[PDB]
Amino acid sequence: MFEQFESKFIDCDGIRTHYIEMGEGDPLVLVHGGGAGADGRSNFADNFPIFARHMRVIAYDMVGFGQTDAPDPAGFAYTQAARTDHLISFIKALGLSKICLIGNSMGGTTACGAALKAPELIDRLVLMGAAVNISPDDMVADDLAAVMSYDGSEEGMRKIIAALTHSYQPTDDIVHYRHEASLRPTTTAAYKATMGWAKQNGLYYSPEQLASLTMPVLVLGGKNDVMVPVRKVIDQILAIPQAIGHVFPNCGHWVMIEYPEEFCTQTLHFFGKL
Amino acid sequence: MFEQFESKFIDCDGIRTHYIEMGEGDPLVLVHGGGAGADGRSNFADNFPIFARHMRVIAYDMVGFGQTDAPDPAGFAYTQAARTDHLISFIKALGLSKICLIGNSMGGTTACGAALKAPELIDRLVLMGAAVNISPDDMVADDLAAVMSYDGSEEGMRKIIAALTHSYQPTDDIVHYRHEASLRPTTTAAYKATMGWAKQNGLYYSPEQLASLTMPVLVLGGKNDVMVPVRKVIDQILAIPQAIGHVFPNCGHWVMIEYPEEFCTQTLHFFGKL
Fold this sequence. Notes:
The structure is a homodimer of 274-residue chains.
Chain A: E1 8-12, E2 15-22, E3 27-31, H1 40-44, H2 48-52, E4 56-60, H3 80-93, E5 99-104, H4 106-117, E6 122-128, E7 133-134, H5 136-139, H6 145-148, H7 154-164, H8 172-181, H9 185-201, E8 203-204, H10 207-211, E9 217-222, H11 230-239, E10 244-248, H12 255-258, H13 260-270
Parallel strand pairs in A: 3-4, 3-5, 5-6, 6-9, 9-10
Antiparallel strand pairs in A: 1-2, 2-4, 7-8
Helix pairs in contact in A: 3-4, 7-8
PDB class: hydrolase
Keywords: Carbon-carbon bond hydrolase, Rossmann Fold, alpha/beta hydrolase fold
Assembly: dimeric
């Protein structure tokens, strides 16, 4: 599946990194979520054609995900820092400057991290259902039953999608892809270290860090998002003084997938392409 | 000032009602705020040309305001009901159906009221810095010093504008118009009854009423709005299940005036014209 996109690879400080890209002009980088078997194409395929009409749109796989190198967690620590540094490394390796950047969920954590550490690389930031103010306590706070206790079955995967979206009905090919993606032995162990770390340390930046962002910011969230509650998204809107806020009704944790055109419209508009 | 618009008048159940309009196609009605000397043109003049490219855009003066009949408050009660019924009367008198509707502040109270009482008249609702969950206690809750204790001077009017917006610098002709508008003997007494009533009764609808809205809703607010705090706007977003929410940064109580293009863009888009 997804063979309409050419798989590309580039070394990012020792981490061979998978990415796909389409279109020309100003660079736009898309950062996927932290779910089991999540990757660039499964998160963003649907948005690629609209984005590519206006920009050079790029989606990569975070370290420990997709077809990017997943260094053995016997020797590699899957911290937020590692994802953040990898993103920074990825941007520099492709020689992009002043990019537009969109992260969903843990991809939002990573985008936010790169925006803080390397602001010179990023002109515009979009935090979408972003895990940027999520404490350890928050990580274990019922709505996530289908996620937390996923049994690796196809039915279980359909239950995840159903729990993470409002009314979105995936195709069988999407279900099959996500299901198989979640079982890849390569990224299994990496994912368990990733989630173990996130549960223990949380995925957050201090209120002061969030107020210290130096570029324009757009904050997006679904009102019915059970993984990053809308109140957390509201908190981000209020914590980042310059942040534009947009709340999507009848919408879960995957704004880009659940409302692909509205997502592309709001972001492209914020990028100055509409 | 504002002579580019033709002043029109229509009887609305005994209330001679001033309105201006421009453009053709689907109807859009704009409801002004509750400030001293507020009216259709001073609130919306700047948005008229953009709106008129796409729709028939209409701004009227609420009962007790502008050039509309202000029945003597010795014999007329200036309740919210009266403004709500007047709006309903206005829509019916022009023979409009399935309109798009935008209210700012007390105009938002009125738009919300008409949407609840006569939903058949309204296809799309925009509540903008809308006073729809404001209790009596909230009405007296420092940031409003320039408003609350306006002395009727030109300097006082500049202080109001400065307190109600983030960085907006009005022209001298705008200052002069608003200043004189606030002193009209005709609408003086009507305004005092209007404000007296609002302070005593609040400007609100119950959480259940807000959840009972039957058409699509867009909720807009400035993050720096001191008259309708952004948290009140956030509360509206969460109280109305179908409501889209959009928060404007570096923005006070007059979104339509402070960011006229972004305001027109978001609303027209929500109206399906972009």
